[PDB]
Amino acid sequence: MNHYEVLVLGGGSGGITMAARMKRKVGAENVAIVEPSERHFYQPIWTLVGAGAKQLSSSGRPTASVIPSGVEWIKARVTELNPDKNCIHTDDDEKISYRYLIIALGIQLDYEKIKGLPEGFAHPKIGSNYSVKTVEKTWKALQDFKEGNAIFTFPNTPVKCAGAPQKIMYLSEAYFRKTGKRSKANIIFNTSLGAIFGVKKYADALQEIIQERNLTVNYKKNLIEVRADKQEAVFENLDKPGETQVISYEMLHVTPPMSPPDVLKTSPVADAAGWVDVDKETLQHRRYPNVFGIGDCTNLPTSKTAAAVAAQSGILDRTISVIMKNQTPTKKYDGYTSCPLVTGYNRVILAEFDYKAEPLETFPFDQSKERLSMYLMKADLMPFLYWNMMLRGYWGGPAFLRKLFHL
Amino acid sequence: NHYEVLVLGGGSGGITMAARMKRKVGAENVAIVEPSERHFYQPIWTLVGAGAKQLSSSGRPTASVIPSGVEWIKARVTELNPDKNCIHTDDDEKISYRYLIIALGIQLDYEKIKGLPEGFAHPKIGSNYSVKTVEKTWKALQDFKEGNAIFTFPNTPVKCAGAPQKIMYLSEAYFRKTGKRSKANIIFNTSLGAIFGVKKYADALQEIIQERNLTVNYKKNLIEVRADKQEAVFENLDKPGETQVISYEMLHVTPPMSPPDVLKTSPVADAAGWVDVDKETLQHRRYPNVFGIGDCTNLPTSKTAAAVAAQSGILDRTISVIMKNQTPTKKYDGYTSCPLVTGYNRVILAEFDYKAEPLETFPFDQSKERLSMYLMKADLMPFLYWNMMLRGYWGGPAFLRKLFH
Numbered sequence: 001m002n003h004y005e006v007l008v009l010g011g012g013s014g015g016i017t018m019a020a021r022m023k024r025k026v027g028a029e030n031v032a033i034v035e036p037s038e039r040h041f042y043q044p045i046w047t048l049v050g051a052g053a054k055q056l057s058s059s060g061r062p063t064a065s066v067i068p069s070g071v072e073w074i075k076a077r078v079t080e081l082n083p084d085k086n087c088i089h090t091d092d093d094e095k096i097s098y099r100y101l102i103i104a105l106g107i108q109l110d111y112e113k114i115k116g117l118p119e120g121f122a123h124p125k126i127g128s129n130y131s132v133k134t135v136e137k138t139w140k141a142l143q144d145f146k147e148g149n150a151i152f153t154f155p156n157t158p159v160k161c162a163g164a165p166q167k168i169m170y171l172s173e174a175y176f177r178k179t180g181k182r183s184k185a186n187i188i189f190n191t192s193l194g195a196i197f198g199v200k201k202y203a204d205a206l207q208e209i210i211q212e213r214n215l216t217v218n219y220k221k222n223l224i225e226v227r228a229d230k231q232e233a234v235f236e237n238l239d240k241p242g243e244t245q246v247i248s249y250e251m252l253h254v255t256p257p258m259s260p261p262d263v264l265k266t267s268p269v270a271d272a273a274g275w276v277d278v279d280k281e282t283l284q285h286r287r288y289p290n291v292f293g294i295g296d297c298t299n300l301p302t303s304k305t306a307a308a309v310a311a312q313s314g315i316l317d318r319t320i321s322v323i324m325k326n327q328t329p330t331k332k333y334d335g336y337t338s339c340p341l342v343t344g345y346n347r348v349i350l351a352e353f354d355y356k357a358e359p360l361e362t363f364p365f366d367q368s369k370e371r372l373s374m375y376l377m378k379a380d381l382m383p384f385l386y387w388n389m390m391l392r393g394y395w396g397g398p399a400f401l402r403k404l405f406h407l
Numbered sequence: 408n409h410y411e412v413l414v415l416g417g418g419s420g421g422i423t424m425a426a427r428m429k430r431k432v433g434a435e436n437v438a439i440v441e442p443s444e445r446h447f448y449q450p451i452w453t454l455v456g457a458g459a460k461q462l463s464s465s466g467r468p469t470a471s472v473i474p475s476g477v478e479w480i481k482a483r484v485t486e487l488n489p490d491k492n493c494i495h496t497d498d499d500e501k502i503s504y505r506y507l508i509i510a511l512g513i514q515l516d517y518e519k520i521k522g523l524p525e526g527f528a529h530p531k532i533g534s535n536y537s538v539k540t541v542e543k544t545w546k547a548l549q550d551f552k553e554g555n556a557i558f559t560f561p562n563t564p565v566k567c568a569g570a571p572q573k574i575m576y577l578s579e580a581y582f583r584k585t586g587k588r589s590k591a592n593i594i595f596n597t598s599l600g601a602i603f604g605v606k607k608y609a610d611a612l613q614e615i616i617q618e619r620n621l622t623v624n625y626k627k628n629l630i631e632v633r634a635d636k637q638e639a640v641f642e643n644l645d646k647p648g649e650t651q652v653i654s655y656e657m658l659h660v661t662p663p664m665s666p667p668d669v670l671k672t673s674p675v676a677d678a679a680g681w682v683d684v685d686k687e688t689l690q691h692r693r694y695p696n697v698f699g700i701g702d703c704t705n706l707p708t709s710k711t712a713a714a715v716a717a718q719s720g721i722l723d724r725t726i727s728v729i730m731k732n733q734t735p736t737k738k739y740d741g742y743t744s745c746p747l748v749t750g751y752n753r754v755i756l757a758e759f760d761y762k763a764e765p766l767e768t769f770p771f772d773q774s775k776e777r778l779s780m781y782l783m784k785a786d787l788m789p790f791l792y793w794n795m796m797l798r799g800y801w802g803g804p805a806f807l808r809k810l811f812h
């Protein structure tokens with residue numbers, strides 16, 4: 001059986017980052033990454049790609065070019081995890097054993113749980129910044145928008161980047177004003193949630209924008225169907241089960257329902273919900289001590305962002321090194337996460353918070369204000385630091401910056 | 408192999424729907440896929456764990472509830488391919504269907520709690536949710552000398568959201584009946600922030616909680632059993648990372664629950680793994696010849712046999728009108744019922760709908776503890792279950808509610 005000291009499932013943000021970190025700790029030849037996609041994506045830039053401000057192609061690199069050099073790339077899907085036997089199966093009918101397992105499988109997109117998707121995306125006027133196949137369709141829908149409803153959704157599931165479904169709404173609103181068709185757009189956010197954002201400071205700041213820019217937010221409204229040929233969307237009222245609503249759109253941005261990766265859903269490593277069942281402070285698996293999880297696939301109760309991945313990777317690096325010495329991990333994850341809320345083509349509200357859902361801002365100024373500096377940071381600095389620093393394992397979140405800024 | 412109507416699951420919903428469908432398409436045209444040689448009337452397990460009923464009476468051979476002529480395929484569904492109108496079993500058969508009813512129930516995941524289910528081999532710990540452990544609840548009640556009696560509620564959806572609480576009230580009564588109430592610290596550690604989802608019954612239970620000196624710790628979720636050391640580990644869902652190791656003299660575990668594994672990844676599931684059905688008609692949202700009933704569905708109401716009965720009424724009409732190329736007009740209202748056993752002789756009969764507002768069958772106030780409702784729960788409902796519901800003649804008590812008004 002193929003064997004690696006450190007086996008990393010998923011070659012995404014978390015998996016590459018931990019592979020680079022683990023390469024430095026155990027040597028590259030003892031690390032393998034299981035990843036089926038030929039292409040690795042800096043997904044946060046898809047917000048700006050859907051708004052026409054960045055190019056799709058710049059958002060991706062070949063997976064081979066982000067594999068830490070010398071680490072083995074197993075180009076395959078994990079199809080089963082047998083942690084009791086310290087091994088996994090791949091869809092190449094190979095079994096791979098490990099001494100340590102890092103699970104970074106991300107979150108799965110379930111567009112097909114909406115009736116009418118993904119077939120509907122073959123039609124104009126509908127996009128989704130969440131898929132490489134559909135984010136440019138967001139932008140085309142935004143360009144071709146003449147008049148009517150512009151509808152942005154948020155599903156009844158966990159989600160990666162809970163801000164992205166409204167980032168594209170603010171961007172669309174700014175685009176309508178830039179091109180003089182704001183008058184002709186009724187902009188609706190139908191979210192499954194009961195609040196616009198889960199942290200009070202930034203929720204209030206977004207509320208001001210919603211009022212100030214005549215945005216409509218319908219809470220507890222969940223998209224369940226797209227009739228893309230008729231340019232109609234069906235939303236269910238989660239507060240009144242059985243009640244639905246058919247609304248016409250001139251533009252629809254769909255945030256798909258998301259779920260644990262199918263292979264994790266039924267796995268012993270998952271909790272009952274399907275997420276990788278890890279210690280919420282050390283990211284060590286609760287039942288399999290040589291198993292670790294990072295990022296969207298875990299049950300860490302914080303927002304599912306790449307920023308959380310970065311902070312998590314610093315913690316998990318310490319956790320695994322301590323576990324290898326057969327010691328007890330002492331460095332705790334605080335739930336650090338960040339949501340750079342793009343509120344226009346040149347403004348970001350930089351939401352940063354922790355497990356308590358209270359602000360944990362990096363910079364000495366008030367990040368609840370729409371800032372140019374934070375837009376530039378999100379649009380131009382963060383991709384660079386992602387490719388050249390985070391993926392090389394040299395970025396563990398901005399906590400040191402926060403502590404250095406508080407002198 | 409082909410059946411006009413294939414029923415997945417030979418539990419409450421499956422047998423009920425197979426009986427109704429037998430009457431509509433003929434026994435020879437219905438099949439039930441069900442691995443278990445025994446069919447259980449699970450609601451009595453609450454009373455079995457309190458020693459007031461017996462496990463043997465809870466179960467009958469599955470063969471004796473399969474409606475005569477309906478084919479019993481003794482296997483596990485291992486895959487659903489609704490685009491091809493077929494399922495696969497663990498006998499590596501394909502079974503095709505014209506119409507599919509999914510009644511796979513809810514899955515118990517004791518093994519998501521570190522230390523379970525191995526820790527059940529040790530005394531002082533039971534669970535009313537499993538035929539393997541409900542008698543262990545009762546022995547833990549009997550062997551209790553002194554300390555904490557801990558009753559849990561997990562951070563998942565569950566069937567019978569009241570049962571984890573019921574056995575707490577029964578345990579309290581058992582402690583008073585045998586004189587050891589003074590020596591029992593009785594704690595309900597629930598992942599929820601409320602004792603019950605319907606305010607009328609929540610407040611009734613709140614009074615019982617205060618009056619009987621019960622402790623409720625909200626947002627506390629069992630993550631680990633150290634059964635040899637008699638310790639339970641809870642995570643504080645309000646402060647991630649924070650846990651608490653509590654000593655117990657008795658632990659009743661309500662396991663984490665989840666959609667059955669085969670549905671979790673299936674095309675018929677919504678994103679969370681529940682069968683994605685129309686909330687009023689129980690027709691699948693995306694596969695018009697698929698239907699769901701009971702715990703395995705995403706119907707946003709409590710997962711109870713009572714809900715199943717009311718849903719079987721609606722789903723019967725739904726499938727009939729679909730087979731007749733009609734559009735469905737009869738709408739499920741989310742009716743469900745929780746017979747909250749609050750003692751060995753009292754029940755608060757919670758009945759409510761999708762609005763989580765009371766929808767009581769009887770003319771009197773059911774938020775009061777009542778001997779009549781206990782007798783209904785303990786003696787009438789099992790009889791109506793075996794001899795009416797599983798034969799297709801019980802569609803919930805809505806006609807009773809309207810005849811009583």
Ligand SMILES: Cc1cc2nc3c(=O)[nH]c(=O)nc-3n(C[C@H](O)[C@H](O)[C@H](O)COP(=O)(O)OP(=O)(O)OC[C@H]3O[C@@H](n4cnc5c(N)ncnc54)[C@H](O)[C@@H]3O)c2cc1C
Binds near residue numbers: 046077130161297340
């Ligand atoms: C539109 C959008 C905007 C976003 N904006 C932001 C933002 O502004 N800021 C921010 O911090 N975050 C943002 N994010 C979130 C960020 O992209 C993710 O949180 C981050 O990628 C999570 O890392 P991960 O490694 O857990 O998942 P991923 O990076 O998605 O990696 C998971 C990997 O696992 C692989 N995989 C899946 N199934 C299997 C299998 N069975 N076997 C093997 N491999 C498998 C996948 O191919 C993928 O490569 C955004 C996301 C989206 C979609």
Ligand SMILES: Cc1cc2nc3c(=O)[nH]c(=O)nc-3n(C[C@H](O)[C@H](O)[C@H](O)COP(=O)(O)OP(=O)(O)OC[C@H]3O[C@@H](n4cnc5c(N)ncnc54)[C@H](O)[C@@H]3O)c2cc1C
Binds near residue numbers: 418536570669746
């Ligand atoms: C302790 C307890 C107390 C309860 N008390 C009450 C009460 O007072 N009132 C009330 O209304 N309800 C109560 N309930 C709830 C009630 O028992 C259930 O809601 C009811 O059984 C749901 O019916 P179902 O058919 O959806 O699932 P089930 O009755 O559980 O049946 C599902 C069936 O699917 C089968 N199955 C599973 N996986 C597969 C597979 N892969 N292939 C094939 N078959 C499969 C199982 O063997 C099972 O027979 C209680 C439940 C418990 C556990």
Ligand SMILES: COC1=C(OC)C(=O)C(CC=C(C)C)=C(C)C1=O
Binds near residue numbers: 210211214215216218
């Ligand atoms: C229906 O969409 C809207 C909201 O979502 C519920 C708001 O919160 C707000 C802000 C609320 C008030 C009362 C000014 C506005 C203006 C609005 O149009």
Ligand SMILES: COC1=C(OC)C(=O)C(CC=C(C)C)=C(C)C1=O
Binds near residue numbers: 044308310362383
């Ligand atoms: C691109 O993903 C992101 C990170 O990971 C690379 C961050 O660390 C952070 C936080 C970074 C700083 C400089 C506060 C943000 C906002 C982010 O969006």
Ligand SMILES: COC1=C(OC)C(=O)C(CC=C(C)C)=C(C)C1=O
Binds near residue numbers: 394
């Ligand atoms: C540039 O390299 C980095 C460090 O070295 C100075 C850090 O300490 C840290 C943070 C570590 C702690 C313990 C706050 C990060 C995130 C980092 O990226």
Ligand SMILES: COC1=C(OC)C(=O)C(CC=C(C)C)=C(C)C1=O
Binds near residue numbers: 712714744746788796
């Ligand atoms: C066995 O499970 C149950 C039902 O299904 C048969 C019910 O219909 C009902 C409701 C029945 C009446 C007469 C109110 C209850 C309370 C119940 O517990």
Ligand SMILES: [S]
Binds near residue numbers: 161162164305338
């Ligand atoms: S995000």
Ligand SMILES: [S]
Binds near residue numbers: 566567570744745
């Ligand atoms: S129940």
